[PDB]
Design a protein around this nucleic acid. Structure first.
Length: 49
DNA sequence: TAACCGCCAAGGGGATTACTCCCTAGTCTCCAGGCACGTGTTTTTTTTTTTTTTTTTTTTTTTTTTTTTCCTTTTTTTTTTTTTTTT
């Protein structure tokens, strides 16, 4: 479970790995979700601020 | 009905004796295939690296702008206070 919490802190988009459960019925938004994506920290905040 | 026996007749060829002769038994002497020893080159086995297709993983999906709506927990177990009954 410690490895599960560490992995979901790092990457919650890993297939074959149980998704982290948030309080509002959503998956947890990890740091990879903050960076990778069109609306991410790179494309939506550094590329397109 | 001709096997078998008795009787008679005839002849054919194996046994016997002698002479010969010739092929093998025996004995040297030279030499060469038959055999004991060593080994091989194909045959099978095992690795080794690649090949080729299948399967899985992962990442991706034009940009900008303006309005609402709903939600931003919830049941389920444990605890703690309160109230009632009894001696």
């Amino acid at each position: 479970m410690l490895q599960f919490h560490v992995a979901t802190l790092v990457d919650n988009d890993m297939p074959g790995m149980p998704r982290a459960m948030q309080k509002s019925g959503k998956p947890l938004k990890a740091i990879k979700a903050r960076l990778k994506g069109k609306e991410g920290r790179i494309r939506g905040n550094l590329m397109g601020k």
